Amino acid sequence: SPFSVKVGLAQMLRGGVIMDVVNAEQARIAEEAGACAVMALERVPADIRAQGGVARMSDPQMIKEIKQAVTIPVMAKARIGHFVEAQILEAIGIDYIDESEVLTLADEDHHINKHNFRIPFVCGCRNLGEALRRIREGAAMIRTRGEAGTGNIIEAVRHVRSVNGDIRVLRNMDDDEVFTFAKKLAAPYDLVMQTKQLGRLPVVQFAAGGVATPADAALMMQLGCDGVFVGSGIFKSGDPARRARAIVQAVTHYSDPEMLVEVSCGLGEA
Amino acid sequence: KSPFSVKVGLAQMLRGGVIMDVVNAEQARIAEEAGACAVMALERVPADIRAQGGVARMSDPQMIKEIKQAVTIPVMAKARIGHFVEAQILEAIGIDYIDESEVLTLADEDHHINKHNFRIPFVCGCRNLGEALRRIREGAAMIRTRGEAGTGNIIEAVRHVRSVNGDIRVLRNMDDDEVFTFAKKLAAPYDLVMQTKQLGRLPVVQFAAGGVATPADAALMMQLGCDGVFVGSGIFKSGDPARRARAIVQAVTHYSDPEMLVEVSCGLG
Amino acid sequence: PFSVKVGLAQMLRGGVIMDVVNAEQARIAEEAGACAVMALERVPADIRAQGGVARMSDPQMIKEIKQAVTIPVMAKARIGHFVEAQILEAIGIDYIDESEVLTLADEDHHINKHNFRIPFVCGCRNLGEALRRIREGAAMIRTRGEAGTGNIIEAVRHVRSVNGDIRVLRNMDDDEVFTFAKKLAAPYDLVMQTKQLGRLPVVQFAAGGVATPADAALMMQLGCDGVFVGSGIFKSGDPARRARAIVQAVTHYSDPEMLVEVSCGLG
Amino acid sequence: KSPFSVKVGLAQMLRGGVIMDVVNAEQARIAEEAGACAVMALERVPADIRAQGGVARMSDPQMIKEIKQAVTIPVMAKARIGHFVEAQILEAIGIDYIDESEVLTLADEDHHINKHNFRIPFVCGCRNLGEALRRIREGAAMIRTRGEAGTGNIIEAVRHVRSVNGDIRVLRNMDDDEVFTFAKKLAAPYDLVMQTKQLGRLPVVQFAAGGVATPADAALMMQLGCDGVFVGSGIFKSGDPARRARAIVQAVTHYSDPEMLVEVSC
Amino acid sequence: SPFSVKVGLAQMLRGGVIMDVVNAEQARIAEEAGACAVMALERVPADIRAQGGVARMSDPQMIKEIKQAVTIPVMAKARIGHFVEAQILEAIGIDYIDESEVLTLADEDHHINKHNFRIPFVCGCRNLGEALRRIREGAAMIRTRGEAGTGNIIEAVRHVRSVNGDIRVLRNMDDDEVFTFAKKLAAPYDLVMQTKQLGRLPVVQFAAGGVATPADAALMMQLGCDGVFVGSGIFKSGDPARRARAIVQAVTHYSDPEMLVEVSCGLGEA
């Protein structure tokens, strides 16, 4: 009912690219390049790993600057388990909250109870069980955690293959054996049977962590992802507008090699 | 007959050849002039990949096309292991051969590209016979021994060449009844193992790669049963690249002629 | 040709094969509607117990059973004992069982079954094991189960393992089947054949611990094409009746009313 | 013709043969009559050695002489491994072959008899090629695969035969440059390894021993590349020993003829 | 036959000192000081350990410069297992090839098949079995590997004592027990019996690795060595001619303490 409408809200981002932006200049460039949403944060994931320090929810002032600078949906990060950082973001009037593992963990044992919010949440996962548990907690959209800040697609591929692999195993599986499968996944049985009946994840599945090139973006789409997230890697190059446009084109035309060649050609240093 | 057999055939044309890593057109011309049978186009060398660290991907199509238009010999380029889209892009640029390379950052830890789904032929690495047979069944048209790229040290290449050729020779004479268990222990497809037994060699062209630094190295690989060698930027990181290039070509052509090896090695710095 | 031997074995689909130690027992098994009999001198329950080495049976006793019935006759060769197989081929039996219930004769190699004109049965515990036996030329696979115990638990584990992995395979990304063949240690061409068919490229029966009609029927409902049954049948009061019951159970495996009638008063 | 080559030659005459364990003259006559190419004289069988326990030595020369005078086919007897004096005694009784046997109680854990110091030829056991080559260099004229005596179980004999013949085949095709390291890993004398490469087989007669109980067993050994088989008192622990004996001889003679194997096995 | 003549060639160096030389200046000094042979290489063993990098066969140009600069035999190094580096050296017309462990190993499992060459090889060893295996592969001369580049005689003494120790054990050994001794050494039985009958190594045995002083050289000779190798240690001093002459004199007069005092006196820093 109110969950299905949050699920529905996130289906509108299918075939899209979401871009990390630290200011309004960057948010405009991302919108202009055809990003389906922007992710507002103050310190990038590559400079969070490197500089160290504690990474929290961004200053509401800077989030509001980005929300008023574009007409596409705006997302922002709450530390895992930080249900009050989420309450604040809901109250600023952003479109989506990302319960992010790129920020400093705030509860080691419990995630936000996402059903208690009106606006939809994105959660990370590395396997099907992790995704189903986030969904039952009320996540409306799943991303594969991948390995943020590296530019290395290897973990994203492992995770996407893990999730889609286990979904395919489910489809043909003897019904009598799905009980034990739900135990081994540590996932709620009703959401596992829903996943069997759909033959896919009961919500939008995007790829995140290490998508650096058009070819990366397209690979994720060909593996069965519904869209991709991309870091500030884009804006740490010579012509950010061009690199941004390239990844959008790549996700739109993911099965067209001729298109991938044209956008990749002369694209510089990643 | 089959589209695979045609790709295997295409790769036989490189037998007795030297393939050279080139980062620009200047280098590609030198390699062609020195008698290289093909060039391998990449932006960052394997010795500077190990050193600088960072993620190593497929090269910019712009620079690959510059090298393709600068020579008439075949051009190869690297796709990260399992990165089937980097391969699609390279197929579409119109290069001759794709190298599914372990010199680049791994992109799938568990799966290699399904190489049968491509029109142009692939090179794959291996360290033993089972690894080579698995790459072939995935559709590799040409195998190289992974060796140990960026070091200048032939020791790993020798281990691997000896491992592969060693196991091929064991196979040739092996009781047929025992080849089933041999296929299990190799974790290799039984039909390609029996094909290898019947031929008494690898069902595709086998080159050596990783640590071939000197003419003597190149010739050693050929005397161990390799069909050709790959060579890194080591060539172009010396005083007279033209000369060092020419020397390794001559060494692979005249691998059983000590008198020739002395002449090309003499004053090589 | 292999496909001819595969085809020969499809004729046993929906059948019960019965261990028999003499002609009296072979006639009872045929009369009860067994689709084949398995000739041996010492049963698997008395092999575990008496100890000692268990070999191919005396050709004299096998020939007595072959001349006593018109249904196919099977006999056991020790694993890897290709000469015990040559002898059985030459006696004119229909099927050779390369059996793990006999004393192993080669720890590292199975018979090269392609070098024989008559078809072979082989055991397995998982898909990889079955595919390897098939490529060696097995025309029919049984799940090894746990012979001599009367305990169905291992047969269920193995049937579920094989059918489970076949189902996983059907829906599996083609690009991932290479690595799947590596992890199974199975020949890639037979794995892709199994994917295309959506089942085992030969007849799959259950063996080891099938003691009751309910056991037989459970095997059939799990996706087996038939069952083997030991001398357990003939170690009871009315062997004819217990034999008939298991045949009926395999024929009518989805009919609870039938299973009640044959199980009732079975002692 | 070296004195070793003559002993090697003597043993080649047993090619295609069956050697039978016999505890008396009655049994020795039956074995000769059934077409055994030699008899092996001992007091306690290997199946009753494992069971009764105790120390197993060279047999009483009296009983060996009774068997030697009872047949015209060669007679063999067992010396404990390393017991060079038990060998001296057997040489002096005038038997044809000495078996340096692991079925008897070991007498030297670290050294085998120096078999070159004897006029008559020796049989030695092995489990792999290196072990065989080392026995040969010590002067063994004939090798048997140790198998697993007293059990009736062919499994160890098959493992060992496959091991030896397997390594011989690996050798045939092997790069010459790599044979040095192969000799190191086998712990075998390099000259005998190169001899084995050049012949494509064992430089002496190779028989199978330990667990050959049935005609099918005997024939399997022959099809795996053995030149003959040894057989225990298993034969004489049956109803008609003459018939079971004759069957194994027929099986080794006609090892690639299934129709023959069926008739003798029935 | 052709092996015995290579063995014979190397017997001519008995009582000699072989000197590592990196140029013709050094080769002349070594010849003048009475060296029985020179060993031609580009990078010394002390600077190979320190600078790191891969150490290969030297440039044939520099080897030929040294061969034409002296009338005493010239040796050069081939990496272990590098049979083509050996073919090249044979073809330059040097007198001896050293299959050296001071260079980067090129085959971990196999040494050069030295019988396939016309000119004689030197090989290293640390024990008798290792020496016998090199000899059977066709080595005409053995050196004890010692510990090259250190100036420390300790490993050379360990190895010389190990080899000569096992040769002495062999001499008195029951013939019946030599079979098992050959197994434990992992050495070819025929070469072990040859060693028993001679009461020494069937080829010339020199000491190498850590011979820095006249006293070192003499100690090696008194332990039963037939000669010594010496590194560039000699040429890394004030008067190379003098230090060179001293070690030659020491090996010639190894049982004359009065001679050892005179050559050692005022010899400076090693």
Nearest CB partner across the interface for E110, out of D111, D138, D177: D177
Q: How far is CA D14 from CA D9, D97, D175, D230, in A?
A: 10, 11, 34, 11
| Cross-chain Cβ contact D155/C106 below 8 Å | yes
Q: Is D183 on the interface with E (CB under 8 A)?
A: yes
Residues in D closer than 8 angstroms to B172, CB to CB, are 173
In terms of Cα–Cα distance, which of B60, B71, B61, B62 is closest to B27? Answer: B71
Q: What distance in Å separates the CA atoms of residue C250 and residue C228, rounded to the nearest whole number?
A: 11
Which residues, 6+ apart, have CB-to-CB distance to B102 below 8 Å? Answer: B81, B125, B146
E/C touch flag: 3 or more CB pairs below 8 Å: no
Which residues, 6+ apart, have CB-to-CB distance to E108 below 8 Å? Answer: B155, B158, B159, E81
3-state secondary structure of A3: helix
Q: How many Cα atoms within 13 Å fall on the side-chain side of residue D41?
A: 31
Say if CB A175 and CB C167 are below 8 A apart.
no
Q: Quick one: A196 exposed, middle or buried, by C-beta within 10 A (0-12, 13-18, 19+)?
A: middle
Residue in chain A lying closest to C198 (CA):
A172
Q: How far is CA E188 from CA C60, D62, D188, in A?
A: 55, 42, 7
Say if CB A77 and CB A51 are below 8 A apart.
no
User: Best of C47, C79, C87 to disrupt the D interface by mutation (most D CBs within 10 Å)?
Assistant: C87
| Residue D252 Rama label (left phi>0; alpha psi -120 to 50; beta) | alpha
In terms of Cα–Cα distance, which of A208, A201, A205 is closest to A229? Answer: A208
C96: β partners: C75, C120
Q: What share of chain E is helix, strand, coil (3-state, %, to 5)?
A: 50, 15, 40
Strands E121-125 and E96-100: parallel
Chain discontinuities in chain D, listed by preceding residue (C to N exceeding 2.5 Å): none
Instruction: Please provide residue E59's backbone torsions phi and psi, each rounded to the nearest 5 degrees.
Output: -60, 120
Q: What are chain C's partners, defined as 3 or more CB pairs within 8 angstroms?
A: A, B, D
Q: Name the one residue in this structure whose structure tokens are 């994931």.
A: A45
CB burial of D95-115 (b: ≥16 within 10 Å; e: otherwise) equals bbbbbbbbbbeebeeebbbbb
E77: β partners: E98
Residue B79, token pair as written in the block: 């796709």
In 10 A of CB E2, how many CB atoms? 8
Q: How far is CA B71 from CA A14, B9, B40, in A?
A: 44, 22, 12
Residues in E closer than 8 angstroms to B265, CB to CB, are 59-60, 88
Q: What distance in Å separates the CA atoms of residue A8 and residue E133, rounded to the nearest whole number?
A: 77
Q: What distance in Å separates the CA atoms of residue D229 and residue D164, rounded to the nearest whole number?
A: 16
Residue E138, token pair as written in the block: 């066709």
Q: What distance in Å separates the CA atoms of residue A116 and residue D109, rounded to the nearest whole number?
A: 80
In 10 A of CB B161, how many CB atoms? 22
Residues in chain C: 267
Residues in C closer than 8 angstroms to D217, CB to CB, are 83
B/A touch flag: 3 or more CB pairs below 8 Å: yes
In 10 A of CB B2, how many CB atoms? 7
**DSSP H helices in A33-153:** 45-51, 60-67, 83-92, 128-136
Kind plus residue range of the DSSP H or E element containing C263 = helix C256-263
B/C touch flag: 3 or more CB pairs below 8 Å: yes
Kind plus residue range of the DSSP H or E element containing A168 = helix A154-171
Strands A204-207 and A141-144: parallel
Kind plus residue range of the DSSP H or E element containing B175 = none
User: In chain A, how long is the greatest CA-to-CA distance?
Assistant: 57
Say if CB B156 and CB B126 are below 8 A apart.
no
Q: Is D239 on the interface with C (CB under 8 A)?
A: no
3-state secondary structure of D262: helix
| Cross-chain Cβ contact B170/D175 below 8 Å | no
Instruction: Please say whether the dihedral angle defined by the alpha carbons of residues E247, E253, E256 and E259, taken in this order, is positive or negative.
Output: negative
Which experiment gave this structure?
X-ray
Say if CB C123 and CB C207 are below 8 A apart.
yes
Measured at the CA of C76, the angle between CA D252 and CA C78, to 5 degrees, comes to: 55
In 10 A of CB E198, how many CB atoms? 12
Q: Is B249 on the interface with A (CB under 8 A)?
A: no
CB burial of D10-31 (b: ≥16 within 10 Å; e: otherwise) equals bbeebeebbbbbbbebebbbbb
According to the annotation, is B162 in a ligand binding site?
A: yes
Which residues, 6+ apart, have CB-to-CB distance to E62 below 8 Å? Answer: E22, E23, E40, E42
**DSSP H helices in chain B:** 3-12, 25-33, 46-52, 61-68, 84-93, 129-137, 155-172, 179-186, 190-199, 215-224, 241-253, 258-265
Which residues, 6+ apart, have CB-to-CB distance to E184 below 8 Å? Answer: none
Q: What distance in Å separates the CA atoms of residue D154 and residue D147, rounded to the nearest whole number?
A: 7
**DSSP H helices in A188-256:** 189-198, 214-223, 240-252
Instruction: Please provide residue B250's backbone torsions phi and psi, each rounded to the nearest 5 degrees.
Output: -60, -40
Q: What distance in Å separates the CA atoms of residue D205 and residue D121, rounded to the nearest whole number?
A: 12
Residues in B closer than 8 angstroms to A213, CB to CB, are 57-58
Q: What distance in Å separates the CA atoms of residue C146 and residue E84, rounded to the nearest whole number?
A: 59
User: Best of B223, B257, B261 to disrupt the E interface by mutation (most E CBs within 10 Å)?
Assistant: B261
In 10 A of CB E154, how many CB atoms? 12
Q: How far is CA A84 from CA A79, A123, A206, C176, in A?
A: 10, 16, 25, 43
According to the annotation, is B101 in a ligand binding site?
A: no
Q: Name the one residue in this structure whose structure tokens are 């037998």.
A: B15
Q: Is E258 on the interface with D (CB under 8 A)?
A: no
- Report chain E's terminal Cα–Cα distance, integer Å: 43
Residues in B closer than 8 angstroms to A231, CB to CB, are none
According to the annotation, is A56 in a ligand binding site?
A: no
Experimental structure resolution, Å:
2.3
Q: Is B57 on the interface with C (CB under 8 A)?
A: no
Residues in D closer than 8 angstroms to B173, CB to CB, are 169-170, 172-173
Say if CB A131 and CB A192 are below 8 A apart.
no
Which residues, 6+ apart, have CB-to-CB distance to C207 below 8 Å? Answer: C123, C142, C143, C144, C145, C147, C155, C227, C228
- Ranges assigned E (strand) in chain A: 16-21, 37-40, 74-79, 96-100, 121-125, 141-144, 204-207, 227-230
In terms of Cα–Cα distance, which of B262, B250, B200, B187 is closest to B222? Answer: B250
Nearest CB partner across the interface for B61, out of A158, A216, A264: A264
DSSP A233: G
Amino acid at D209: A
CB burial of C74-110 (b: ≥16 within 10 Å; e: otherwise) equals bbbbbbbbbbbbbbbbbbebbbbbbbbbbbbbbeebb
CA C257 to chain CA centroid, nearest Å: 27
Q: Is D163 on the interface with B (CB under 8 A)?
A: no
According to the annotation, is B150 in a ligand binding site?
A: yes
Q: Name the one residue in this structure whose structure tokens are 């023959």.
A: D260
- Ranges assigned E (strand) in B66-112: 75-80, 97-101
Positions of C marked active-site: 76
Distance from the C63 Cα atom to the nearest Cα atom in chain D, whole angstroms:
9
Q: What distance in Å separates the CA atoms of residue E82 and residue E85, rounded to the nearest whole number?
A: 6
| Cross-chain Cβ contact C182/B110 below 8 Å | no
Distance from the C39 Cα atom to the nearest Cα atom in chain D, whole angstroms:
15
Q: Is D178 on the interface with B (CB under 8 A)?
A: yes
Does E77 qualify as catalytic in the annotation? Answer: yes
3-state secondary structure of B64: helix
Q: What distance in Å separates the CA atoms of residue E176 and residue A269, rounded to the nearest whole number?
A: 74
DSSP per-residue codes, C59-100: HHHHHHHHTT-SS-EEEEEETT-HHHHHHHHHHT-SEEEEES
DSSP E252: H
In terms of Cα–Cα distance, which of C76, C55, C80 is closest to C65? Answer: C76
Q: Is C189 on the interface with D (CB under 8 A)?
A: no
Q: Is E188 on the interface with D (CB under 8 A)?
A: yes
User: Best of E136, E184, E194 to disrupt the D interface by mutation (most D CBs within 10 Å)?
Assistant: E136
Strands C36-39 and C120-124: unpaired
Q: Name the one residue in this structure whose structure tokens are 């059996």.
A: C99
Q: What distance in Å separates the CA atoms of residue C163 and residue A174, rounded to the nearest whole number?
A: 9
Q: What distance in Å separates the CA atoms of residue A8 and residue A6, rounded to the nearest whole number?
A: 5
According to the annotation, is A20 in a ligand binding site?
A: yes
| Residue B251 Rama label (left phi>0; alpha psi -120 to 50; beta) | alpha
To 10 degrees, the CA torsion angle through B78, B80, B83, B89? -30
- Report chain A's terminal Cα–Cα distance, integer Å: 43
C84: β partners: none
Say if CB B91 and CB B85 are below 8 A apart.
no
Q: Long-range contacts for B113-116 (Cβ within 8 Å, ≥24 apart)? A: B113/B79, B113/B81, B113/B82, B113/B83, B113/B84, B113/B87, B113/B138, B113/C175, B114/B84, B114/B138, B114/B139, B114/C174, B114/C175, B114/C178, B115/B87, B115/B139, B115/B140, B115/B141, B116/B4
**DSSP H helices in chain E:** 2-11, 24-32, 45-51, 60-67, 83-92, 128-136, 154-171, 178-185, 189-198, 214-223, 240-252, 257-264
Q: Name the one residue in this structure whose structure tokens are 């080392």.
A: D134
Nearest CB partner across the interface for A171, out of C163, C164, C171: C171
Positions of A marked active-site: 77
Q: What distance in Å separates the CA atoms of residue D43 and residue D35, rounded to the nearest whole number?
A: 22
Residue in chain B lying closest to E107 (CA):
B155
| Residue A194 Rama label (left phi>0; alpha psi -120 to 50; beta) | alpha
| Cross-chain Cβ contact A169/C171 below 8 Å | yes
| Cross-chain Cβ contact B152/E60 below 8 Å | no
| Cross-chain Cβ contact A168/C167 below 8 Å | no
Residue E35, token pair as written in the block: 């060296």
In terms of Cα–Cα distance, which of C264, C257, C172, C158 is closest to C208? Answer: C158
Residue A142, token pair as written in the block: 């799943």
Q: How far is CA A34 from CA A29, B40, B54, E171, in A?
A: 9, 36, 29, 90
Q: What distance in Å separates the CA atoms of residue A165 and residue A178, rounded to the nearest whole number?
A: 15
DSSP per-residue codes, D184-214: HHHT--HHHHHHHHHHTS-SSEEEE-SS--S
Q: Is D152 on the interface with C (CB under 8 A)?
A: yes
Nearest CB partner across the interface for B111, out of C82, C132, C175: C175
